[PDB]
Amino acid sequence: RLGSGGGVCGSVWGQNDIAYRCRTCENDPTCAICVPCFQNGDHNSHDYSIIYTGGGCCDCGDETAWKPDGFCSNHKG
Amino acid sequence: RLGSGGGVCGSVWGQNDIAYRCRTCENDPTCAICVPCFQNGDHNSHDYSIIYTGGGCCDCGDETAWKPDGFCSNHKG
Ligand SMILES: [Zn+2]
Ligand SMILES: [Zn+2]
Ligand SMILES: [Zn+2]
Ligand SMILES: [Zn+2]
Ligand SMILES: [Zn+2]
Ligand SMILES: [Zn+2]
């Protein structure tokens, strides 16, 4: 899909990878972020869950898919 | 975002790239496909447009983002 470009996580998920949903930070239900981005951000109180994904890419750093308050340390804007 | 995995176009768009919207094939308004995928498929009668994108990735081959009838020749399922 179309997205922001620049300062985004590129991470891509294979047949047996792990990601995180966060209902608090997502723009829509299929957004997700990779394990390092989830752990290097703050989703303490958030309505998150582990996903066992067969594909896609991390949305961290992309404000058209994820709230900037939920970006991790390494993907400012 | 989460997607299908396998037999998808990987293509990623930079600061001054071109993509195509196709309202007939898309699942939602921000889906898009790259120039080679659009040209190697059949969107003749379709409600398509050229996009001058600053980021994102091609959705061709990913049935969670694009209708399979709009996949190109090289991205069957
Ligand atoms: Zn990431
Ligand atoms: Zn990140
Ligand atoms: Zn969150
Ligand atoms: Zn493509
Ligand atoms: Zn294609
Ligand atoms: Zn089309």
Swiss-Prot record, chains A, B:
Effect of gene knockout:
Reduced seed germination potential and inhibition of seedling establishment by sucrose. Exhibits abnormal shoot and leaf development. Increased tolerance of seedlings to submergence and starvation.
**What is the top-level taxon of the source organism?**
Eukaryota
| Name the record gives this protein | E3 ubiquitin-protein ligase PRT6
State the function annotated in the UniProt record: Ubiquitin protein ligase which is a component of the N-end rule pathway with arginine specificity, and functions with the arginyltransferases ATE1 and ATE2. Recognizes and binds to proteins bearing specific N-terminal residues that are destabilizing according to the N-end rule, leading to their ubiquitination and subsequent degradation. Does not participate in degradation of proteins with N-terminal Phe or Leu. The N-end rule pathway regulates seed after-ripening, seedling sugar sensitivity, seedling lipid breakdown, and abscisic acid (ABA) sensitivity of germination.
Q: Which family does it belong to?
A: Belongs to the E3 ubiquitin-protein ligase UBR1-like family.
Zinc finger (UBR-type) in chain: 7-77
